[PDB]
Symmetry: D2
Subunit: 127 residues, 4 copies
Amino acid sequence: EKYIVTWDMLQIHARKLASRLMPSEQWKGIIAVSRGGLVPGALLARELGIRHVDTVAISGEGFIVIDDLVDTTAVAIREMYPKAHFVTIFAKPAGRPLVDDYVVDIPQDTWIEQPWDMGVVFVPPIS
Amino acid sequence: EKYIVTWDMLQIHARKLASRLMPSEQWKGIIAVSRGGLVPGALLARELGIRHVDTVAISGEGFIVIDDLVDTTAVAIREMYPKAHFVTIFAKPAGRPLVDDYVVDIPQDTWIEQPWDMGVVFVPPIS
Amino acid sequence: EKYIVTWDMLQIHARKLASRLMPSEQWKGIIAVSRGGLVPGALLARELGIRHVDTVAIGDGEGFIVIDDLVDTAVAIREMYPKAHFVTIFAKPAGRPLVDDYVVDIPQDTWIEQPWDMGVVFVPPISGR
Amino acid sequence: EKYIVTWDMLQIHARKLASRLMPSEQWKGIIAVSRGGLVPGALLARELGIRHVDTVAIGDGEGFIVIDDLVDTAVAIREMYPKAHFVTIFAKPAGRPLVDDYVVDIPQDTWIEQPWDMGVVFVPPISGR
């Protein structure tokens, strides 16, 4: 098949990650990596109570740097923010040792499709 | 555009209809008209506490007959079940006087797409 | 942890099951077991082109698809319809061997939360603020 | 009654707005106003092909898209970015005249429930049984 990620599921995953980052008072802010980190970043911010989310784009103590998935950009993040808490929603075998924390494990060979790249449209019957 | 109906929204509509049919003890059962009435029927049954949903297919006192939308089949239902409480989730101007109750009003010219006929798939960017 | 099942995901499972039930030309009808099997039965009917779904509260069975949401007794269903193709969406271990086909394997101790018993509502922030 | 907004519907609105913002070749970037505007900004960036979304907690503006979720003060945004194209998803009456473009009209007294503040959870049957 194909690893489909719906909004509801992404939200559930993000909420689990949020609870794992408590207490919220220990964080100064959240840095989301465009574009995949934007939505998960906004969710964490809403769950933790952080009013503002900063954004970056690749080619910091107390800050959380978030990205949707880590397959291989992790390096650039580590160089720019050495003291940041790098977290991701999904993680493959290769990138697993790069993030400080993640939520769901997906096989290296899985084609994962994110909710922002999909939509609800008419799907013809199989018959 | 096109009138898109998602699962969550259909469920909300059904729940509103369910609350309008209280008390639940006054109903003997629920008759769903295949196929559009199946899902809404199962939802009502779950909300009212009716363990079994009967099904019919067109070419009853205490029973609720449900269909997804009434555009023009309403007649056949009235003949087969003269004492049934005919209800629908959606209703257009033409069929509005035929049902005993409904939830949402949609223009006669609106192309309504139901959740069971759709799905979450990849949608190319507009750019 | 409970196995949350959203409408979208259930539909994916149902469609996948429909694919296995092809071609549709062989099936004479669908018998959805109330009350959970009704929704997946409706989805199957749609995907297979079957215009009518019959329901039973519990005709030899040949050509009919008997569907229920989960399995873990099916013995009664098999007794009522011996020659029917009994299928389900989810299935636990002990119940796995009794169905003709299913889609997702669920651990015996896992509590499945079906879409129809849930709803989209306000959820307070974990931090309370 | 509150205006419930689900992820699916929000996305539909966002895409519709994106269509009006075409072609994309004219925009130099997107400035999402925290914290609600960030999600729609991400969707716009995706639809328009804009690789980076900037955020502001509140460069003349020419070529940039300043987006927020709802409007009903925008006066500060207009002051910070005079030559920017201020857009939103929803908009109330009093706030309608201040935005350059929006998608859905919301009555002034309507309480909008955004997707990010909601979640899919168990909902007890109305009949209690």
